[PDB]
Amino acid sequence: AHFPQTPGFSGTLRPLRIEGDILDIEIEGEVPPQLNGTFHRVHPDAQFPPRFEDDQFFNGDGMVSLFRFHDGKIDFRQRYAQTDKWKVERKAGKSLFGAYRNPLTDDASVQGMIRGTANTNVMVHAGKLYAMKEDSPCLIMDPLTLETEGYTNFDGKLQSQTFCAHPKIDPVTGNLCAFAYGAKGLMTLDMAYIEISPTGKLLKEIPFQNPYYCMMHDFGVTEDYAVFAVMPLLSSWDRLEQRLPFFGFDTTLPCYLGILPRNGDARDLRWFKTGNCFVGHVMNAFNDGTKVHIDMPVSRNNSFPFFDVHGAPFDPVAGQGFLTRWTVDMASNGDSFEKTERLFDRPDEFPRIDERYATRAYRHGWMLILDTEKPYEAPGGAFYALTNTLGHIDLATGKSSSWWAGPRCAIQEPCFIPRSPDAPEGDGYVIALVDDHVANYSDLAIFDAQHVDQGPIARAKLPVRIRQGLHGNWADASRL
Amino acid sequence: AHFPQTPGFSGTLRPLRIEGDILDIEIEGEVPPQLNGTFHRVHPDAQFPPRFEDDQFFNGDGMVSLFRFHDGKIDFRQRYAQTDKWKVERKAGKSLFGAYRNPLTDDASVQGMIRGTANTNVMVHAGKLYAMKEDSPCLIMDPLTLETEGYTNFDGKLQSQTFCAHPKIDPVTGNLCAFAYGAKGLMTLDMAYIEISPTGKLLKEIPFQNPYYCMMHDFGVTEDYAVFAVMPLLSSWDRLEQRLPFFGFDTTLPCYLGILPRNGDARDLRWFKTGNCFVGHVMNAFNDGTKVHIDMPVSRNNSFDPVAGQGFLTRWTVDMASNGDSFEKTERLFDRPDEFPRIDERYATRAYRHGWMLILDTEKPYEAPLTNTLGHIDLATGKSSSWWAGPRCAIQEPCFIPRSPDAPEGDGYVIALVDDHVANYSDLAIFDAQHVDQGPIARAKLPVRIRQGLHGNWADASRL
Ligand SMILES: [Fe+3]
Ligand SMILES: [Fe+3]
Ligand SMILES: [Mg+2]
């Protein structure tokens, strides 16, 4: 009823909190008639006002959106993920859990509960929808009704208390390749590489130890290795008692890259070391023999201003991430990299690939671009987190193109859809939410993947603006 | 999925069509904590693009909104009324029924089906929600889930094929007082005065004939009489054959006022005649002995030419004791163009003085790419006050809530949706009924603009 009038809950970040349905969205243009599948997507949307006036973006309850493609039509369905947190807070009619990653600020009635909001990523696997949040197990939902089944441990087999929100689909085995940090609770170095079969059975859970008490948000998977990028985004329980941000970036410590053979154990894990930097989302990773490549935006400090870290304001220029390839060789001796190479010279994040080529050699990528030289005429919005541009890069040529959403709009994470199962790499479509911050409408815009610069070929016009979310995924109807 | 690019489906009249819920709406100010009940409300919202690009606003599928008040909180729930039309069209994934009230344009697959959209009014009665559209039976829904149960003939008793969307609640008996026109199908002169008990049982269905086939949208109920305003808004099968709009107003025919004793029959009905004009919604009606008063906006032509469409709240007076068919009085009650009148319905059918209305203030700026004013009139003194919503907003039909059961007439709150046509958000504004010029005392802030609707009603939780 009464949300704190902090910027975190006002203007373009106002609460939405509407579950609902639209049958047959209004289309401007023509939805590609062959497309038949689901595009899932999630945003934080605190059900009730927070205990803390300062409660953060990534702490809001997960609101899941479904866009079902079929017969040149798109349907809309949106539901709260009914996490243990969400269920108990609804019964109380108020928020019971506290600050971000801080159980010391929880109400006494919910101590020991799973504090996850399932607000970071949603992906179809094993005929179900996996709703994910780092600090908590995987939440199982129905891909079409968006009903919540409950957290899972994969029939008692998984020991890890947590489950990452950035798994990859092995394009050969169809296995869900995931991982977990803090696998034995907050502030533990216990890690795990996880593979889930196409029918939901836990196949392997390879434990190992991390170099830091740090955040491990994303990782890479190659044909033979799991790739873990370790940054000094450090955590400490002292900070929670002082009521400071759980994570704080240390600009003096180095970064590591851990290569775990997917068929080995912690004994075979080799650590490589490089200079200090901030590592973003992994576009893709792949190995050529013992040569391992991983592509991700690299910046000098935190790239997300909604992500409150401790110490040293928010440097918006030091937070500019550029798509960078890291290369190590398992055949070499020592912990030296072979190569670091900037792949793209514009600040970017939220990278995407033709997922048929995940874990393999590839050339086509899409990304959100921060074009600060463009006007932004929408009052009530952070100019910092303004992804106003969609970009495409041909890594084989370095050529790139982009599209500007205009001065009224932001763009959310894109997603690639192939034109057909055996279409060439990157031949198909890119979809993304384009949010008009003046009229408060959202379009699910459809681009030609190879000509994003020509603007959308179609727009699914929603009569509502979807709150800025995180990650989404496309699944063909055959996966259901 | 491809709606026409006409004005009736673009801009502020864009399709909405979202069913959904919000628990604990954002509140600016304070929702009066005593309030515990429901505000229902409905707008047209075609589920699929129409068969004809010039489809009327009034032809769209009914979308019902629920605002459940409790303990200073308001929850939101919005659902489609699952009429026979809506169900079959969803099955087919496209619009099967054709032009407004024109069965000659329906697809063959739905011929003889009920063409109602239930898009005009929603009112709690006998523990259920009555969803109404003139050309069709009453639709029964659940007041809290907004589930649909189906059309009703009240246990097979009701003979009328139709059921009005403007019933009044008798403040003494608790009966739902309704009527029906075209009761034996389209273009039929058959009429009926209807009463439904507080438990849903049909108590009386009094048939009579209408002076001609015309729109009979609203009517009045007094302590002793039912009051039927007849204007020459005509329709014939011939109009439908030429694919003209169903209704066509005739400037040369007179208007009638038919007074029917509630406990009598068609032989006891008296017709009074007056000059040509266009009649609008009924604020209220009452009788003082044999003198019958009815207050309603009156204009020269359709208000539902902007100058001819200017309707002014007017009182019509006839005397049942008199001989002949002359009125006694016609008196303009308000000098500003107005519509959607409302009263403290605890005084419905009885003498009253407090009314609320929407006012079209043409001297105000509108900065969007129009009811912009909420009014209050004290009929005992002619005094009035109003509130302008600003250059970006419009106001939908208001509705009165008494501060308490024993409160004096007009003592309480007036609620209405206020729509920002630039930011595309809607607020459920709460005013003090006696000081609407002071602006809202509270705003329930929706993260969406509710489409332009029709009629809504308040019901205390005790009625659930
Ligand atoms: Fe992420
Ligand atoms: Fe009406
Ligand atoms: Mg739109």
mmCIF file with all atom_site columns, N, CA and C in Angstrom, chain B residues 194-216:
data_model
loop_
_atom_site.group_PDB
_atom_site.id
_atom_site.type_symbol
_atom_site.label_atom_id
_atom_site.label_alt_id
_atom_site.label_comp_id
_atom_site.label_asym_id
_atom_site.label_entity_id
_atom_site.label_seq_id
_atom_site.pdbx_PDB_ins_code
_atom_site.Cartn_x
_atom_site.Cartn_y
_atom_site.Cartn_z
_atom_site.occupancy
_atom_site.B_iso_or_equiv
_atom_site.pdbx_formal_charge
_atom_site.auth_seq_id
_atom_site.auth_comp_id
_atom_site.auth_asym_id
_atom_site.auth_atom_id
_atom_site.pdbx_PDB_model_num
ATOM 1  N N  . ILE B 1 194 ? -39.882 -5.607  -14.225 1.00 0.00 ? 194 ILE B N  1
ATOM 2  C CA . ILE B 1 194 ? -39.404 -6.796  -13.534 1.00 0.00 ? 194 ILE B CA 1
ATOM 3  C C  . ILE B 1 194 ? -39.015 -6.416  -12.116 1.00 0.00 ? 194 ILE B C  1
ATOM 4  N N  . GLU B 1 195 ? -39.266 -7.327  -11.177 1.00 0.00 ? 195 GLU B N  1
ATOM 5  C CA . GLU B 1 195 ? -38.739 -7.219  -9.825  1.00 0.00 ? 195 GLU B CA 1
ATOM 6  C C  . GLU B 1 195 ? -38.191 -8.571  -9.396  1.00 0.00 ? 195 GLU B C  1
ATOM 7  N N  . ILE B 1 196 ? -37.033 -8.543  -8.742  1.00 0.00 ? 196 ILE B N  1
ATOM 8  C CA . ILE B 1 196 ? -36.347 -9.739  -8.267  1.00 0.00 ? 196 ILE B CA 1
ATOM 9  C C  . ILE B 1 196 ? -36.178 -9.605  -6.761  1.00 0.00 ? 196 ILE B C  1
ATOM 10 N N  . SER B 1 197 ? -36.539 -10.657 -6.028  1.00 0.00 ? 197 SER B N  1
ATOM 11 C CA . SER B 1 197 ? -36.469 -10.626 -4.580  1.00 0.00 ? 197 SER B CA 1
ATOM 12 C C  . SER B 1 197 ? -35.014 -10.542 -4.120  1.00 0.00 ? 197 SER B C  1
ATOM 13 N N  . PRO B 1 198 ? -34.782 -10.228 -2.839  1.00 0.00 ? 198 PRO B N  1
ATOM 14 C CA . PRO B 1 198 ? -33.403 -10.164 -2.333  1.00 0.00 ? 198 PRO B CA 1
ATOM 15 C C  . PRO B 1 198 ? -32.697 -11.511 -2.310  1.00 0.00 ? 198 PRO B C  1
ATOM 16 N N  . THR B 1 199 ? -33.405 -12.575 -2.683  1.00 0.00 ? 199 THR B N  1
ATOM 17 C CA . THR B 1 199 ? -32.822 -13.906 -2.797  1.00 0.00 ? 199 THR B CA 1
ATOM 18 C C  . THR B 1 199 ? -32.774 -14.402 -4.238  1.00 0.00 ? 199 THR B C  1
ATOM 19 N N  . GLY B 1 200 ? -33.119 -13.557 -5.208  1.00 0.00 ? 200 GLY B N  1
ATOM 20 C CA . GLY B 1 200 ? -32.999 -13.912 -6.605  1.00 0.00 ? 200 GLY B CA 1
ATOM 21 C C  . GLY B 1 200 ? -34.248 -14.466 -7.250  1.00 0.00 ? 200 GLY B C  1
ATOM 22 N N  . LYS B 1 201 ? -35.368 -14.506 -6.538  1.00 0.00 ? 201 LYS B N  1
ATOM 23 C CA . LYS B 1 201 ? -36.600 -15.059 -7.075  1.00 0.00 ? 201 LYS B CA 1
ATOM 24 C C  . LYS B 1 201 ? -37.366 -13.990 -7.836  1.00 0.00 ? 201 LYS B C  1
ATOM 25 N N  . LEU B 1 202 ? -37.889 -14.372 -8.996  1.00 0.00 ? 202 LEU B N  1
ATOM 26 C CA . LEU B 1 202 ? -38.710 -13.464 -9.781  1.00 0.00 ? 202 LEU B CA 1
ATOM 27 C C  . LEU B 1 202 ? -40.035 -13.238 -9.068  1.00 0.00 ? 202 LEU B C  1
ATOM 28 N N  . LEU B 1 203 ? -40.317 -11.983 -8.729  1.00 0.00 ? 203 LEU B N  1
ATOM 29 C CA . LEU B 1 203 ? -41.553 -11.623 -8.047  1.00 0.00 ? 203 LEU B CA 1
ATOM 30 C C  . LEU B 1 203 ? -42.635 -11.139 -8.996  1.00 0.00 ? 203 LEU B C  1
ATOM 31 N N  . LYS B 1 204 ? -42.272 -10.408 -10.046 1.00 0.00 ? 204 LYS B N  1
ATOM 32 C CA . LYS B 1 204 ? -43.271 -9.966  -11.008 1.00 0.00 ? 204 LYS B CA 1
ATOM 33 C C  . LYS B 1 204 ? -42.594 -9.617  -12.325 1.00 0.00 ? 204 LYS B C  1
ATOM 34 N N  . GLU B 1 205 ? -43.310 -9.893  -13.414 1.00 0.00 ? 205 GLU B N  1
ATOM 35 C CA . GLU B 1 205 ? -42.873 -9.564  -14.771 1.00 0.00 ? 205 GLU B CA 1
ATOM 36 C C  . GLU B 1 205 ? -44.114 -9.055  -15.497 1.00 0.00 ? 205 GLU B C  1
ATOM 37 N N  . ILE B 1 206 ? -44.272 -7.736  -15.534 1.00 0.00 ? 206 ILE B N  1
ATOM 38 C CA . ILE B 1 206 ? -45.499 -7.097  -16.001 1.00 0.00 ? 206 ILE B CA 1
ATOM 39 C C  . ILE B 1 206 ? -45.280 -6.667  -17.450 1.00 0.00 ? 206 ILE B C  1
ATOM 40 N N  . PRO B 1 207 ? -45.882 -7.336  -18.430 1.00 0.00 ? 207 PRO B N  1
ATOM 41 C CA . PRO B 1 207 ? -45.663 -6.946  -19.825 1.00 0.00 ? 207 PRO B CA 1
ATOM 42 C C  . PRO B 1 207 ? -46.543 -5.781  -20.244 1.00 0.00 ? 207 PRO B C  1
ATOM 43 N N  . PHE B 1 208 ? -46.017 -4.996  -21.179 1.00 0.00 ? 208 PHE B N  1
ATOM 44 C CA . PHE B 1 208 ? -46.777 -3.940  -21.833 1.00 0.00 ? 208 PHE B CA 1
ATOM 45 C C  . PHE B 1 208 ? -46.109 -3.642  -23.167 1.00 0.00 ? 208 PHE B C  1
ATOM 46 N N  . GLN B 1 209 ? -46.739 -2.769  -23.948 1.00 0.00 ? 209 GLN B N  1
ATOM 47 C CA . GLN B 1 209 ? -46.255 -2.417  -25.273 1.00 0.00 ? 209 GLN B CA 1
ATOM 48 C C  . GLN B 1 209 ? -45.655 -1.019  -25.261 1.00 0.00 ? 209 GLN B C  1
ATOM 49 N N  . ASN B 1 210 ? -44.636 -0.825  -26.115 1.00 0.00 ? 210 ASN B N  1
ATOM 50 C CA . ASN B 1 210 ? -43.951 0.446   -26.217 1.00 0.00 ? 210 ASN B CA 1
ATOM 51 C C  . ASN B 1 210 ? -44.506 1.257   -27.386 1.00 0.00 ? 210 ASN B C  1
ATOM 52 N N  . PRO B 1 211 ? -44.496 2.592   -27.300 1.00 0.00 ? 211 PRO B N  1
ATOM 53 C CA . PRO B 1 211 ? -45.071 3.398   -28.391 1.00 0.00 ? 211 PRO B CA 1
ATOM 54 C C  . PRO B 1 211 ? -44.436 3.124   -29.743 1.00 0.00 ? 211 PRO B C  1
ATOM 55 N N  . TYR B 1 212 ? -43.162 2.748   -29.766 1.00 0.00 ? 212 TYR B N  1
ATOM 56 C CA . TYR B 1 212 ? -42.481 2.348   -30.989 1.00 0.00 ? 212 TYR B CA 1
ATOM 57 C C  . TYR B 1 212 ? -41.195 1.660   -30.559 1.00 0.00 ? 212 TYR B C  1
ATOM 58 N N  . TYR B 1 213 ? -40.528 1.017   -31.513 1.00 0.00 ? 213 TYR B N  1
ATOM 59 C CA . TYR B 1 213 ? -39.292 0.318   -31.188 1.00 0.00 ? 213 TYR B CA 1
ATOM 60 C C  . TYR B 1 213 ? -38.148 1.317   -31.156 1.00 0.00 ? 213 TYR B C  1
ATOM 61 N N  . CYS B 1 214 ? -37.556 1.472   -29.979 1.00 0.00 ? 214 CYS B N  1
ATOM 62 C CA . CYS B 1 214 ? -36.515 2.456   -29.754 1.00 0.00 ? 214 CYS B CA 1
ATOM 63 C C  . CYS B 1 214 ? -35.617 1.944   -28.643 1.00 0.00 ? 214 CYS B C  1
ATOM 64 N N  . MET B 1 215 ? -34.486 2.615   -28.466 1.00 0.00 ? 215 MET B N  1
ATOM 65 C CA . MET B 1 215 ? -33.636 2.312   -27.329 1.00 0.00 ? 215 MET B CA 1
ATOM 66 C C  . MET B 1 215 ? -34.350 2.691   -26.038 1.00 0.00 ? 215 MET B C  1
ATOM 67 N N  . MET B 1 216 ? -34.428 1.743   -25.109 1.00 0.00 ? 216 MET B N  1
ATOM 68 C CA . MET B 1 216 ? -34.911 1.991   -23.751 1.00 0.00 ? 216 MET B CA 1
ATOM 69 C C  . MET B 1 216 ? -33.761 1.627   -22.819 1.00 0.00 ? 216 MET B C  1
#
